[PDB]
Amino acid sequence: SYTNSFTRGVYYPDKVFRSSVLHSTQDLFLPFFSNVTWFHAIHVSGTNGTKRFDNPVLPFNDGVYFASTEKSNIIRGWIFGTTLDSKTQSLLIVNNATNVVIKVCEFQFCNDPFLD
Amino acid sequence: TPSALGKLQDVVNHNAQALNTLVKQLSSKFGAISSVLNDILSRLDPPEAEVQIDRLITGRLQSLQTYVTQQLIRAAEIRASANLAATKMSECVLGQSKRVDFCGKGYHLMSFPQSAPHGVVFLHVTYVPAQEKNFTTAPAICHDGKAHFPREGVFVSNGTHWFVTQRNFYEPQIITTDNTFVSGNCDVVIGIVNNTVYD
Amino acid sequence: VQIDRLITGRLQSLQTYVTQQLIRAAEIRASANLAATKMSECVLGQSKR
Amino acid sequence: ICGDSTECSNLLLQYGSFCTQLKRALTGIAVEQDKNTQEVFAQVKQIYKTPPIKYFGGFNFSQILPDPSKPSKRSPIEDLLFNKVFNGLTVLPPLLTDEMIAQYTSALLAGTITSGWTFGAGPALQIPFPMQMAYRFNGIGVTQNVLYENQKLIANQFNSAIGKIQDSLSS
Amino acid sequence: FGGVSVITPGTNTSNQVAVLYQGVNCTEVPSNVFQTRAGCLIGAEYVNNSYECDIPIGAGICASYQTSQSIIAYTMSLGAENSVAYSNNSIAIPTNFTISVTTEILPVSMTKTSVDCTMYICGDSTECSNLLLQYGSFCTQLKRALTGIAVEQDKNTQEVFAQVKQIYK
Amino acid sequence: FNGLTVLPPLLTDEMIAQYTSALLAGTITSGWTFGA
Amino acid sequence: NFNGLTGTGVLTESNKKFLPFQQFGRDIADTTDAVRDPQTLEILDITPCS
Amino acid sequence: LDPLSETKCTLKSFTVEKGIYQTSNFRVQPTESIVRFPNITNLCPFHEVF
Fold first, then answer.
1. For an engineered disulfide with D107, which of A100, D47, E89, E137 has Cβ 3.0 to 4.6 Å away?
2. Which chain B residue lies closest to D58 (C-alpha atoms)?
3. Distance (Å, whole) CA E111 – CA B11
4. How far is H35 from chain E (nearest CA, A)?
5. Are B125 and B105 within 8 A, CB to CB?
């Protein structure tokens, strides 16, 4: 716990057009005025290589809110899965110019994934 | 005052809420896999869909019966209010009624009906006295050894003389033999005072 | 199969209770209006009825 | 409907809004029961009080006026009338307690005795009780002289009739 | 157990509300704690002054929004304590008058509605109406009930306003 | 609008207004003689 | 039948403005009275049959 | 989040008027499941079989 989310974390629960009405939907949302971990990982920067930095794995119970203030190209994708070691499928959303690679292929990961 | 017409907003919002509830209750499973009839008839077979449609029709008929019962319960009070409004229209507008608090708070004088959406408004004209004063009263007087009771009035005294005024308006008048009547002698009334009448 | 019938029976019983309460409250309101009319006519004045 | 069950609440919401309309109906019933007591007893703005002396021309009102020699401040007739008449459901108390109803009844009684009917159609106009009875007798056809002649007999009959009310209500 | 009740003194004025734990003795709720005869009120304080009942709470307790603006609890006052100077030889005869015109709102009729026992029950279906007629006779009495309700609502307006034969101008 | 048919009242607002105006005229110009 | 939305009614030219991520819309009582055909971008009102 | 938001959700409106509005029902949650049982005296004579 490092910061708080005042009124952020609301999305469209469905594709139903509603005009000047009030609707209640029981779905997975983000509670207002809650704790949002402000993880900062800037240990290695400027150089290349360094296939071993310091960051842990994050759990995914039912849903996460991912906000980021990256300037130009810091955030370039995510990595999902449950075992992450050649046993279950994963989900790479690696970002890139003009195209974003998406794949649900199953393979082995490393303890510190990064794009070089 | 926006709450002056709250009684008229109570017979209209209730009907809208009942209709909205009756419409929303259709999207509620009464023991079926879904609510759409076509989806149940397509995703299942007739001998199995007959187990769910017989419960859906039961739930919908029960909801309609509940709606009809609530409508009858509301119509009972609506009829009571309409009868009360007709009685007031007949007793205050078509004449002068002496019933207290019926044709407004005070002495009923007039009443003018005003049309209203799903209702009626009565403008009761009441007579409210004001600027009252303190006076000394007495049951009767005894001029010629005989009692004199007020016919239509009240014996008042400003401190020196004894006059006779109305029961709802101070109108000082001399005590004469026309507004008083003799009844018995001056030996049974408690509190009688001595005064002279003007024949 | 059993809980959906138990909840239905309980909801029907609660609806019957609410309906009986409304039917009784109608007569309660009628009696309260009659009592208010009597309080306004016999106590606050001399009614000739 | 759901007694300490977690799987029952998930299915209770599948039948629609059958739970909110009954709660609204009960709330409306409670508001109606409160408005009835508000419109039946609370009909006057001024809370009149009885004078210290209790000699109203010879009429004994000790059976209807509130008795201050008790922690409840209620009339003995009201005392006789009061001393004779949980798995998800609650009992809401009324808005107006018994003390407020007793005060309203005492104020109405004081206004009827000391003013008659003038306190119900405007300002309270003081008037002696023997003169109030003379005006109330003229409304039925009987002249007021009969009252000024038989006030003692009328007061005795009124006291004898009021005294038997408690016996009739108790027996 | 019991039921909670939030006392909100309007949103256009302030966002300071108070909760009422009906039935709780203020010893089971997990900021002026005060125990009333109708529950446990958390959020208001009991003032000695008695004002007019603005927000009804229960058992004589009432709420309002009065001054630091906050919610205060108080026993409702029935009115002023007038003392009529009763005397055997004193009467009050009025000298002036004030004609006042009051209003009284009374409903006459409501919205006339009529439902369909086939379209509302069976939505654009054909085999549904085949079993609808065999599930009982609960489709002809409701239509007649609604027709009678409509006739009653019309008769109310006919007997309330149309009480004279001549239309005077 | 899925089976609900709201029926309009028999006496419109114009007829109610005319009735109220006639009652007002009878109360002002005749008093209580037009009701008996 | 607009991708599962099966029902009856009249398809009339509406005047609404749907956001570029929605197809259909419901009224105050959860009744489908508007849908966008996923063939050519155009609003369509769904009024009930007579 | 807060009782005012719960009142707003109950009335289904962002503007709550002046008054008392019920929102939910209070309930203390039970915890220790007391599995109380009587003595255990009449044990089976398994010592004379083995």
1. D47
2. B190
3. 8
4. 24
5. no
